[PDB]
Ligand binder design. Sequence first.
Ligand SMILES: Nc1ncnc2c1ncn2[C@@H]1O[C@H](COP(=O)(O)OP(=O)(O)OP(=O)(O)O)[C@@H](O)[C@H]1O
Ligand SMILES: Brc1ccc2[nH]ccc2c1
Ligand SMILES: Brc1ccc2[nH]ccc2c1
Length: 327
Amino acid sequence: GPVPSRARVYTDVNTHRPSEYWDYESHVVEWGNQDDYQLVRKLGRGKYSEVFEAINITNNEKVVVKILKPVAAAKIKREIKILENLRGGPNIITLADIVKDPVSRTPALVFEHVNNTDFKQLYQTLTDYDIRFYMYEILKALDYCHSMGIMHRDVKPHNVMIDHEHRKLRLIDWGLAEFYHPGQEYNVRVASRYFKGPELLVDYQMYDYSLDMWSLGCMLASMIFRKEPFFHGHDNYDQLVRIAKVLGTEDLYDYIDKYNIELDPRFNDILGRHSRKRWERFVHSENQHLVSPEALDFLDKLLRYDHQSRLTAREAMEHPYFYTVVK
Ligand SMILES: Nc1ncnc2c1ncn2[C@@H]1O[C@H](COP(=O)(O)OP(=O)(O)OP(=O)(O)O)[C@@H](O)[C@H]1O
Ligand SMILES: Brc1ccc2[nH]ccc2c1
Ligand SMILES: Brc1ccc2[nH]ccc2c1
């Protein structure tokens, strides 16, 4: 069968913390007062929750309320335990309260409000320096959560809120996050299509923190190359073919051979034979202002098939790409 895998970092974090830390099922939720919050406007609805801009009437401060759908209401102790564990961590969204919504009869998570700058506006105007700056901020959140024995599993642009005026960034939506336990087989049905790591696309279940590093690399490639999304698959199968057209099929076969993984036979008639492309192929006059040899070297070390071969978040922070960032 498949060869086992374990993270190269933070492998022992959940065994050396008390069981109360990771055993989310045993956690007793401390319910707050739903009357403290007045819903103001519906911001959006996803598959797992309805999101509202609200006001905390006990302090007159803006808050964000996530009213969980019943499908999310089952795995809420996991999200709550993760949010409580990571609270106060660098660039981690702050869970302010947990209340019972009187209408939905489900939990509503109350978060600090972030006056986020419009996503299109940030993608279209962030400078080379700003991309480095904000990428370093995201790395602080990922190294923190990984050091805390947690993988986000849904790193993507919409889960990174930026208040550009205050140079403030928060990593949000911890609903898909999990505790990392060496040897555990996880569900591969995580992350958004364009950000799914090759381990998910080849159904390799014994993955770890490094999945977040692939997703981060997909965001960086889209940002510096002005190509949204960078790997533009029609479905989960074409998603792997899109990756193979850039990294090449030879390294993909070396990856699946190393882990004794068998590709779905449906890849026999769609994968083809592709050489690895040099990152310079993606540079053009409209993105050259965002590209540098250090950006390309950094990206090359995130976007690797072998999950054990990608930079870790702490190693990534040491990369020359960040030397210009004021610390
Ligand atoms: N902490 C927060 N502060 C301010 N706005 C927030 C916060 N968390 C979420 N939002 C709001 O959530 C809205 C986005 O809707 P929703 O949260 O359902 O999905 P998303 O983050 O766009 O992506 P996805 O649902 O695919 O993960 C935005 O209007 C954003 O301002
Ligand atoms: Br760099 C960077 C990282 C995450 C982001 N989310 C929205 C804009 C943006 C920029
Ligand atoms: Br980094 C990054 C990559 C792609 C994006 N699309 C919209 C915001 C954004 C940020």
